[PDB]
Amino acid sequence: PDRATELDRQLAEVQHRVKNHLAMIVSMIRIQSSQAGGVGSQFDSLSRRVEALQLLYQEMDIAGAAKATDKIIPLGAYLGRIASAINHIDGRGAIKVNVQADTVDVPVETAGRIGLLVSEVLTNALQHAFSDRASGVVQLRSSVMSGEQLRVTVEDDGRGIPEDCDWPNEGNLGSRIVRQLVQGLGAELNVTRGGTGTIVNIDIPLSQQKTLIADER
Numbered sequence: 001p002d003r004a005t006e007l008d009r010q011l012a013e014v015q016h017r018v019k020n021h022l023a024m025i026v027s028m029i030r031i032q033s034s035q036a037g038g039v040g041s042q043f044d045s046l047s048r049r050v051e052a053l054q055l056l057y058q059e060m061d062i063a064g065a066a067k068a069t070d071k072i073i074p075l076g077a078y079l080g081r082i083a084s085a086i087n088h089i090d091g092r093g094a095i096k097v098n099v100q101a102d103t104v105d106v107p108v109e110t111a112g113r114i115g116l117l118v119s120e121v122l123t124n125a126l127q128h129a130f131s132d133r134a135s136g137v138v139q140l141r142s143s144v145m146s147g148e149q150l151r152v153t154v155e156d157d158g159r160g161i162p163e164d165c166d167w168p169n170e171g172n173l174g175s176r177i178v179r180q181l182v183q184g185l186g187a188e189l190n191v192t193r194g195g196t197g198t199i200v201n202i203d204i205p206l207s208q209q210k211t212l213i214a215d216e217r
């Protein structure tokens with residue numbers, strides 16, 4: 001409310017370095033922020049999505065300018081700060097959140113897509129997986145494998161995604177975000193259900209990111 005124009009300036013700087021669905025997504029977030037004008041943003045996932053984009057802006061600011069295809073964003077650092085914010089706000093006693101992120105530099109567009117992705121899925125774990133549970137575990141992993149394949153995992157031991165619900169093909173706004181960003185990353189998403197929990201795995205080709213980013217231009 002005192003940072004409205006500054007927040008908007010940051011989200012615009014992000015917006016003007018990205019494209020396609022991602023750029024659109026940032027555009028929406030910018031508008032919705034101003035409408036509430038604060039705060040205004042905390043009662044739903046808006047605050048969370050703003051924070052993912054601000055944390056990304058901070059990484060860009062530190063990294064300086066470079067070609068859209070240049071690997072300049074430290075993903076592990078960025079995902080760690082997303083995860084920390086989420087467990088701090090949306091966490092709860094008796095719920096353990098482990099975080100294991102590899103050191104890897106990626107392009108801005110790649111980071112933004114993955115960051116929002118992790119925000120969506122991880123929030124989902126803490127918000128939904130433990131409704132009726134007294135204790136739980138969430139694990140976030142980000143592992144570089146062979147052939148520049150990055151695997152991002154979010155694991156619950158909680159309640160499980162309802163069977164009728166075929167997330168992320170079905171769901172609320174979060175599910176639509178996830179499907180778009182996965183597509184923009186050239187990635188593959190998979191989900192595993194049950195009362196033993198929800199396991200989400202996104203396989204991302206970091207080798208193909210340069211190609212994706214330049215095709216958008």
Ligand SMILES: Nc1ncnc2c1ncn2[C@@H]1O[C@H](COP(=O)(O)OP(=O)(O)NP(=O)(O)O)[C@@H](O)[C@H]1O
Pocket residue numbers: 044045120124125128129130156158159160161162165167170171172173174175176198
């Ligand atoms: N880890 C999980 N464990 C249990 N249920 C889940 C989990 N993730 C998602 N769900 C369920 O799937 C639904 C769809 O989630 P989603 O598409 O992200 O929308 P949402 O989280 O409800 N609202 P939004 O803030 O926009 O994401 C949720 O409402 C939950 O009922």
Ligand SMILES: [Mg+2]
Pocket residue numbers: 120123124174175
């Ligand atoms: Mg959600």
